[PDB]
């Protein structure tokens, strides 16, 4: 409960054996902004730090310090990923396990509310009273963990023109459908423009592109219509260290030497080695060298350089 | 059955090819116990030559290296079978054995190459989960922080993240009864072992069982250059170190290469006959020197499967032999020679015809 | 049969054309809508050396001129009208060994490429190596690598690959050399595959047998339906990898139907079909199958798969459902697990365990007696003291353990010997203050340690 700028954590069933409620934060220098609670994790974000505690013992486990301040927080339902807006009107995805912040590319701070999808843990939405946009965070690509807004094809920075349909009030997200609590009280359902046709396996360009942009690559392989899409999917599957899908796509693409090379590395799970091999396959020898060098198999840049 | 028949009737070329195809099929179809058996007997077959051909020493070395590589691959696949089963199949396990198995797999997957369809992700996830469950909190934290540098299946990271954050709350105090003990350095193993499953302190490889992967009380010592394996057996049949062992741990030594103990004649005279184990690597007809081990704690019963020449706990090996396939690794059955009674296959085909002609 | 011949016409106002470039001859030929071919020769003093053939398409009517690097053909449009007299447009078909011509003013590169083509037709590629060093167009390096494939020289070919930075193909060549050092044809096939020519792998070692590698190549081209039908008749040792690869291909396609049926067809349903059902959280359907027109195909095979019965028994056994485990083990006739469960239960169902153990001892005795009586025909004249014994039954072990927990160690010793537990046999035999059984069990163990320690065990 948040009162007086402080949160009390208390059991509900008042029993004599139950412990006393506790009060957070411990230092009153930082003003609290938002909290979230899970089955085992208590998360609270001040204007400075995001802190997570284990409910069974109440000990600090993750404490990510926002150097640029904190304006709002939106924790994922599992209380591990926090999309938080700092004072500079920019949105950052924070993995509290690694305590890593990633700049949400394409984030327009007009939409200031963030809601995680309750089915897929790698999709959230940014909305205001007017419209919403979709953000996908990849946990490991060749560029590390990323978070990018879904963009219209043939549009590198901007999105499509959106004449706002009146009256809609987005409230919750689930599987690309937004439950909107209308003023009348009934719950309308708005399908996301970025999640349409994503459940048809017939050849259709829109289905492939939408599942492509959401890191639903294996699903998207069912909707390929042209070999250009196939090679794009192959490049992207190599991009996010998915060896098996890389082999599956390249089997159609008629590049047997690459397939037989990938089948030797489809088993290795260390991230550095996969990054090195994939960068070498794509042709980025320099990055591959340091990737192998900081790996556990350093004597692969030697064979590469020979 | 064709492979067994080829094994009986020499002809090592076709036995070689068929064993390659079978080991490859076992690896690609993830039949890791089958692959381990095929590789451990393929290493033994690599010493088989036709009587018409006498190989050079160059070819003998070129096949000794592949014999040792296949022994290593067999050990890795046999260890990895149970861990992969626990990770993917919804079957419980033995906690301590799976913990030590993942520990050994980490000790063998560090710097050496990784055989096909062996994933570090499964090993790390298994070791992390079991160390968390077995209150091996420090090692659980180490494996968990190492796990972030390893990708995982698309439906694993939620529980992985929850467990990584949860284990940070737990106090860091590992129990000493679940930690491996290196008897050469007489010190426990707290840190994660390096490549080769060697001791963190004195670089000594761990003499492990191959059912539960427990470091048996055995140290490895190689004979001096003036002694040979034949002479070692002669002096064993025919017939202080407290001061010596302290000098072994002296600083300044080159810490990039293992230094084994050296055996002289007088120390072999002073050695008790029951306290020495002789390992003869059965790579075939190839000449490979016999390795020697010393046992100092007689309270643990150790054995060596003659078809496999791997160390086991004697009672554990006996219990595992009752599964109807001999040794769990090489499927060796005592009381009969290498060439079985292959007429059993003829009766099996007779019984197959009978079952076809029942109705 | 030929129709016309043409020399390389030098370009107007271009007197800097090389000498060898003057001697190339092109001939238009057709076999006996006829096929069209354009064949190239080097008119050397020693005779006519054939350079290369070039088939022409249906719209490519004929050849009108030659001007290096192009055959000038008065063809028609692909979608045009051959009946039209006005659709006769000229096409400058590139010479096959003049690919990657980015610059039409590229003079030195073109001359050295023509010299390389001449030297390739001559063949002795040692100086054809130097014919291309001046050239930095990588297409010349690719052509040189194709020549290295056709000839059979690889030390040049390693540099040919590694100067184009095809690290995939160079890695493949290095691995082929390292793993298959005795065979050079496989390294040639790997090099040909890395050079995007694929029909050559079968032709290389077709009948001298390398069926596995061409199976892998046939899979790697996406032609599973060719590889499986090839291996069914021709390569019987690798049907299971073809099925398993197709099942992995379908699983990565997110089609659990074909993936599951092919993981069944690959005889790996003991570990992989349960994997798919458990990781799709479809365990209710698996329970339904173990205890809809298209579901007929699944239910035809699933409920009686002995490996599936055994896996479900293990699953329910470790799910603390002991009785369902016993039911499924008896449905899968796994004697060892049944005996273990029965000897583990409270109370231990000892009589049924003894019955099943003695039934397996009966079958083992039957096999030993059959083989012994079969062998005794030639042993009538040949006196052989072959003390063969029946195969011991491992399932008896637990039974002896029960007597080992009940003080009936004399009874336990018989089952330990019947199980082959020589170490447990001598473990039992200690408390009798017996030594002869100790000694003979040590002998029967046929392992050095078992007498090596029982020696000084007896000496004390
Ligand atoms: Zn040590
Ligand atoms: Zn063995």
3 state SS for chain A? CEECCEEEECCCCCCCCCCCCEEECCCCCCCEEEEEECCCEEEEEECCEEEEEECCCCCEEEEEECCCCCCEEEECCCCCEEEEECCCCCEEEEECCCCEEEECECCCCCCCEEEECCCCCCEEEEECCCCEEEEEEEEEECCEEEEEECCCCCCCCCCCCCCCCCCCCEEEEECCEEEEECCCCCEEEEECCCCCCCCCCCCCHHHHHHHHHCCCHHHHHHHCCCHHHHHHHHHHHHHCCCHHHHHHHHHHHCCHHHHHHHHHHCCCCEHHHHHHHHHHHHCCHHHHHHHHHCCCCCCCHHHHHC
Cis peptide before A163 (omega within 30 of 0): no
List A residues 121-140 in contact with B (Cβ-Cβ < 8 A): 121, 139-140
Is B305 annotated to bind a ligand? Reply is yes
Residue B95 CA to residue B99 CA, distance in Å, equals 6
CA-based nearest distance C373→chain A, Å? 52
C153 three-class SS: coil
Does residue A55 sit at the B interface (CB-CB below 8 Å)?
no
Strands B181-182 vs B187-188: parallel, antiparallel or unpaired: antiparallel
Residue C408 CA to residue B15 CA, distance in Å, equals 48
Q: How many CB atoms lie within 10 A of CB A240?
A: 20
Question: Which numbered ligand comes closest to the C-alpha of B258?
Answer: 1
Residue C291 CA to residue C309 CA, distance in Å, equals 10
Query: Which class for C1: exposed (0-12), middle (13-18), buried (19 or more C-beta within 10 A)?
Result: exposed
**Which H or E run includes C29?**
strand C24-29
Is B308 annotated to bind a ligand? Reply is yes
Q: Residues of C with CB below 8 A from B29's CB?
A: 240-241, 244, 266, 268
Q: Which residues are CB-neighbours of A130 under 8 A, at least 6 positions away?
A: A110, A111, A164
Q: Residues of B with CB below 8 A from A140's CB?
A: 151
Q: Residues of C with CB below 8 A from B318's CB?
A: 421-424
Question: Which numbered ligand comes closest to the C-alpha of B182?
Answer: 1
Residue C273 CA to residue C250 CA, distance in Å, equals 13
Q: Residues of B with CB below 8 A from A40's CB?
A: 162, 166
| Minimum CA–CA partner of B163 in chain A | A97
Residue B209 CA to residue B190 CA, distance in Å, equals 19
Residue B114 CA to residue A270 CA, distance in Å, equals 11
> Phi, psi (5° rounding) for residue A50?
-100, 120
**Closest Cβ–Cβ partner in A41, A139, A272 for B157:** A139
Does residue B169 sit at the C interface (CB-CB below 8 Å)?
no
Instruction: List chains adjacent to chain A, taking adjacency as at least 3 C-beta pairs closer than 8 Å.
Output: B, C
Is B321 annotated to bind a ligand? Reply is no
Nearest-5° Cα angle at C295, C293 to C298: 135
Q: Residues of C with CB below 8 A from A244's CB?
A: 248, 252
How many angstroms does the Cα of residue B186 sit away from the middle of ligand 1?
6
How many angstroms does the Cα of residue B117 sit away from the middle of ligand 1?
31
List C residues 241-260 in contact with B (Cβ-Cβ < 8 A): 241, 244-245
Q: How many CB atoms lie within 10 A of CB C47?
A: 8
**Closest Cβ–Cβ partner in C167, C217, C248 for A280:** C167
CA-based nearest distance C48→chain A, Å? 37
**Closest Cβ–Cβ partner in B24, B301, B306 for C447:** B306
Residue C123 CA to residue C145 CA, distance in Å, equals 13
Q: Residues of C with CB below 8 A from B92's CB?
A: 318
Nearest-5° Cα angle at C422, C417 to C424: 95
Is B182 in contact with B147 (CB distance < 8 Å)?
no
Sign of the dihedral through C-alpha A18, A24, A27, A28: negative
**Closest Cβ–Cβ partner in A244, A257, A306 for C252:** A244
Q: Residues of C with CB below 8 A from A245's CB?
A: 252
Residue A55 CA to residue A47 CA, distance in Å, equals 22
Residue C423 has, within 13 A of its CA and on its CB side, a CA count of 21
CA-based nearest distance C110→chain A, Å? 28
C77 three-class SS: coil
Residue B200 CA to residue B110 CA, distance in Å, equals 13
Q: Residues of A with CB below 8 A from C220's CB?
A: 251, 256, 259-260
| Minimum CA–CA partner of B113 in chain A | A297
Residue B319 CA to residue C398 CA, distance in Å, equals 9
Residue C261 CA to residue C305 CA, distance in Å, equals 13
Is B199 annotated to bind a ligand? Reply is yes
How many angstroms does the Cα of residue B107 sit away from the middle of ligand 1?
14
Nearest-5° Cα angle at C376, C372 to C378: 140
Q: Are B114 and A267 within 8 A, CB to CB? A: yes
Residue B221 CA to residue B290 CA, distance in Å, equals 11
Residues of B engaging A, defined by a Cβ cutoff of 8 Å: 110-111, 113-114, 116-122, 124, 148-152, 157-158, 161-162, 164-166, 168-169
Optimal mutation site among A137, A268, A275, interface B, most CBs of chain B within 10 A: A268
Total length of chain C: 460
| Minimum CA–CA partner of B93 in chain C | C318
User: Residue ranges of the alpha helices (H) in C8-49?
Assistant: none
**Closest Cβ–Cβ partner in C237, C367, C394 for B21:** C237
How many angstroms does the Cα of residue B210 sit away from the middle of ligand 2?
9
Task: Considering only the C-alpha atoms of chain A, give the largest distance between any 2 of them, rounded to a whole number of Å.
Answer: 73
**Closest Cβ–Cβ partner in B119, B150, B165 for A62:** B165
Q: Are B119 and A267 within 8 A, CB to CB? A: yes
Tokens of A251: 């089997």
Task: Considering only the C-alpha atoms of chain B, give the largest distance between any 2 of them, rounded to a whole number of Å.
Answer: 79
Residue C111 CA to residue B63 CA, distance in Å, equals 50
Neighbours of ion ligand 2 (CB under 5 A): B 305, 307-308, 327, 330, 332
HEC string of chain B equals CHHHHHHHCCCHHHHHHHHHHHHHHHHHCCCHHHHHHHHHHHHHHCECCCCCCCCCHHHHHHHHHHHHHHHHHHHHHHHHHHHHHHHHCCCCCCHHHHHHHHHHHHHHCCCCCCCCCCCHHHHHHHHHHHHHHCCCHHHHHHHHHHHCCECCCCCCHHHHHHHHHHHHHCCCCCCCCCCCEECCCCEECCCCCCHHHECCCCCCECCECCCCCCECCEEEEEECCCCCHHHHHHHHHHCCHHHHHHHHCCCCCCCCCCCCEEECHHHHHHCCHHHEEEECCCCECCCCCCEEEEECCCCCCEEECCCCCCEEEHHHHHHHHCCCCCCCCCCCCCCCCCCCCCHHHHHHHHHHHHHHCCC
Q: Which residues are CB-neighbours of B290 under 8 A, at least 6 positions away?
A: B229, B232, B278, B279, B280, B281
| Minimum CA–CA partner of A258 in chain C | C168
Q: After which residues does chain B break, using C–N > 2.5 Å?
A: 239
Does residue A294 sit at the B interface (CB-CB below 8 Å)?
no
Total length of chain A: 306
CB contacts < 8 A, A to B, total: 64
**Closest Cβ–Cβ partner in C171, C194, C254 for A222:** C254
Nearest to A179 by CA among A169, A164, A189: A189
Is B56 in contact with B65 (CB distance < 8 Å)?
no
Nearest to A95 by CA among A35, A158, A52: A52
- b/e B269-278 (16+ beta carbons within 10 angstroms → b): eebeeeebbe
Q: Are B89 and C395 within 8 A, CB to CB? A: no
Question: Which numbered ligand comes closest to the C-alpha of B199?
Answer: 1
**Which H or E run includes C370?**
helix C350-375
Is B182 annotated to bind a ligand? Reply is yes
Residue A23 has, within 13 A of its CA and on its CB side, a CA count of 7
CA-based nearest distance A33→chain B, Å? 22
User: Residue ranges of the alpha helices (H) in C184-223?
Assistant: 185-194, 200-204, 211-220
Token pair 């397996």: residue: C360
Strand A41-46: give its sheet, edge to edge: A32-37, A41-46, A49-54, A60-65
CA-based nearest distance C255→chain A, Å? 9
Neighbours of ion ligand 1 (CB under 5 A): B 182, 184-185, 199, 201-202, 204
Tokens of C353: 């365990």
Q: At what angle do helices C350-375 and C396-404 cross, to 10 degrees?
A: 130
The DSSP bridge partners found for residue A189 are: A179
Token pair 């590698």: residue: C213
Is B206 annotated to bind a ligand? Reply is no
Q: Which residues are CB-neighbours of C369 under 8 A, at least 6 positions away?
A: C390
**Closest Cβ–Cβ partner in A78, A264, A269 for B162:** A78
CA-based nearest distance A272→chain B, Å? 7
């Amino acid at each position: 409960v948040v009162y007086d700028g402080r949160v009390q954590l208390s059991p509900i069933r008042d029993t004599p054996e139950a412990a006393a409620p506790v009060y957070f934060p411990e230092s009153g220098d930082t003003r609290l902004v938002s909290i979230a609670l899970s089955e085992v994790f208590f998360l609270y974000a001040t204007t400075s730090r995001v802190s997570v505690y284990a409910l069974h013992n109440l000990q600090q486990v993750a404490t990510f310090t926002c150097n640029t301040g904190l304006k709002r927080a939106f924790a994922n339902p599992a209380c591990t990923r926090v999309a938080y807006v700092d004072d500079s009107s920019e949105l950052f995805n924070v993995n509290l396990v690694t305590e890593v912040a990633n700049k949400a590319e394409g984030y327009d701070p007009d939409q200031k509310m963030v809601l995680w999808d309750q089915a897929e843990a790698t999709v959230f939405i940014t909305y205001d009273s007017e419209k919403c946009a979709t953000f996908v965070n990849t946990p490991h690509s060749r560029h590390g963990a990323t978070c990018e807004s879904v963009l219209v094809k043939d549009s590198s920075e901007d999105n499509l023109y959106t004449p706002l349909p009146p009256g809609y009030t987005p409230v919750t997200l689930f599987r690309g459908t937004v439950v909107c609590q209308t003023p009348n009280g009934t719950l309308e359902t708005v399908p996301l423009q970025t999640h349409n046709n994503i459940f048809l396996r017939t050849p259709n360009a829109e289905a492939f592109y939408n599942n492509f942009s959401l890191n639903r690559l294996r699903w998207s392989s069912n909707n390929i219509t042209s070999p250009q899409e196939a090679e794009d999917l192959a490049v992207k599957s190599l991009h996010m260290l998915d060896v098996e899908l890389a082999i599956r796509v390249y089997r159609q693409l008629s590049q047997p030497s690459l397939v037989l090379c990938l089948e030797k590395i489809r088993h290795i799970h260390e991230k550095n080695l996969l990054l090195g091999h994939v960068s070498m396959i794509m042709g980025y020898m320099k990055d591959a060298q340091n990737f192998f060098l900081r790996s556990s198999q350093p004597l692969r840049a030697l064979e590469m350089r020979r | 059955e064709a492979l067994e028949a080829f094994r009986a009737a020499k002809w090592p070329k076709e036995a070689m090819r068929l064993m390659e195809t079978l080991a490859t099929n076992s690896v690609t179809c993830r039949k890791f116990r089958d692959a381990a058996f095929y590789y451990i007997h393929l290493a033994e077959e690599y010493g088989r030559f036709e009587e018409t051909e006498k190989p050079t020493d160059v070819e003998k070395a070129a096949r000794i290296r592949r014999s040792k590589e296949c022994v290593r691959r067999a050990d890795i696949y046999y260890a990895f079978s149970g861990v992969y089963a626990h990770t993917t199949q919804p079957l419980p396990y033995n906690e301590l054995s799976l913990f030590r198995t993942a520990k050994y797999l980490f000790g063998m997957c560090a710097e050496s190459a990784i055989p096909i369809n062996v994933g570090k992700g499964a090993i790390l996830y298994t070791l992390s989960r079991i160390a968390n469950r077995l209150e091996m909190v420090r090692t659980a934290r180490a494996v968990f922080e190492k796990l972030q540098g390893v990708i995982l299946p698309v439906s694993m990271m939620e529980q992985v993240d929850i467990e990584t954050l949860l284990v940070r709350s737990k106090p860091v105090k590992d129990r000493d009864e679940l930690l491996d003990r290196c008897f050469r350095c007489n010190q426990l193993i707290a840190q994660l072992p390096m490549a080769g499953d060697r001791c963190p302190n004195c670089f000594h490889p761990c003499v492990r069982s191959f059912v539960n992967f427990e470091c048996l009380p055995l140290v490895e010592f190689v004979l001096a250059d003036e002694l040979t394996d034949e002479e070692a057996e002669r002096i064993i049949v025919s017939g202080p170190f407290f001061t010596q062992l302290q000098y072994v741990l002296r600083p300044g030594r080159p810490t990039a290469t293992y230094q084994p103990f050296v055996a002289s004649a007088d120390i072999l005279k002073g050695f008790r006959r029951d306290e020495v184990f002789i390992v003869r690597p059965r790579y075939g007809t190839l000449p490979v020197p016999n390795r020697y081990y010393r046992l100092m704690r007689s309270d643990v019963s150790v054995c060596l499967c003659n078809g496999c020449q791997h160390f086991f706990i004697a009672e554990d090996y006996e219990a595992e032999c009752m599964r109807g396939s001999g040794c769990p690794l090489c499927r060796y059955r005592p009381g009969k020679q290498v060439s079985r009674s292959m007429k059993q296959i003829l009766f099996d085909m007779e019984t197959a015809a009978a079952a076809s002609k029942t109705s | 049969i030929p129709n016309s011949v043409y020399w390389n016409t030098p370009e107007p106002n271009t007197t800097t054309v090389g000498e060898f470039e003057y001697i190339l001859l092109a001939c238009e030929t057709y076999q006996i809508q006829r096929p069209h071919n354009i064949v190239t020769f080097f008119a050397t003093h020693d005779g006519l050396v054939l350079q290369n053939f070039a088939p022409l398409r249906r719209y490519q009517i004929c050849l009108v001129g030659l001007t290096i690097p192009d055959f000038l053909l008065a063809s028609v449009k692909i979608n045009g009208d051959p009946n039209n007299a006005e659709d006769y447009v000229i096409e400058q078909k590139r010479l096959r060994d003049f690919e990657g011509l980015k610059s039409d003013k590229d003079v030195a590169v073109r001359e050295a490429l023509m010299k390389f083509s001449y030297y390739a037709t001559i063949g002795n590629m040692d100086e054809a190596y130097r014919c291309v060093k001046s050239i930095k167009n990588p297409a010349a390096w690719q052509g040189l690598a194709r020549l290295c494939v056709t000839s059979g020289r690889l030390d040049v070919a390693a540099v040919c690959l590694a100067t184009m930075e095809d690290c995939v193909a160079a890695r493949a060549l290095r691995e082929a050399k390292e793993d298959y050092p005795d065979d050079q044809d496989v390294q040639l096939a790997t090099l040909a595959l890395g050079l995007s020519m694929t029909e050559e792998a079968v032709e290389l070692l077709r009948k001298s047998k390398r069926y596995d590698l061409l199976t892998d190549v046939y899979m790697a081209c996406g032609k599973f339906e060719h590889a499986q039908r090839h291996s069914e008749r021709f390569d019987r040792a690798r049907i299971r990898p073809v099925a398993y690869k197709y099942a992995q291909f379908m699983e990565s396609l997110q089609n659990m139907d074909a993936a599951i049926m092919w993981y069944y067809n690959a005889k790996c349903a003991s570990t992989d079909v349960p994997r798919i059902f458990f990781q799709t959280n479809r365990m209710h359907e698996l329970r339904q199958l173990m205890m809809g027109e298209q579901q007929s195909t699944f239910a035809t095979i699933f409920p009686q798969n002995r490996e599936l019965l055994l896996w479900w028994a293990q699953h329910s056994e470790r799910r603390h459902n002991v009785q369902e485990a016993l039911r499924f083990y008896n449905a899968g006739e796994d004697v060892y697990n049944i005996v273990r469960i029965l000897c583990s239960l409270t109370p231990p169902k000892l009589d049924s365990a003894l019955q099943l153990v003695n039934k397996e001892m009966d079958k083992a005795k039957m096999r030993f007696q059959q083989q012994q009586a079969f062998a005794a025909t030639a042993s009538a004249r040949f006196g052989d003291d072959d003390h063969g014994e029946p195969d011991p039954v491992g399932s008896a072990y637990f039974v002896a353990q029960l007597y080992e927990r009940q003080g009936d160690d004399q009874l336990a010793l018989q089952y330990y010997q019947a199980a082959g537990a020589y170490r447990s046999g001598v473990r039992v035999a200690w408390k009798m203050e017996q030594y002869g059984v100790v000694a003979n069990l040590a002998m029967k163990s046929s392992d050095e340690r078992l007498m090596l320690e029982t020696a000084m065990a007896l000496e004390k």
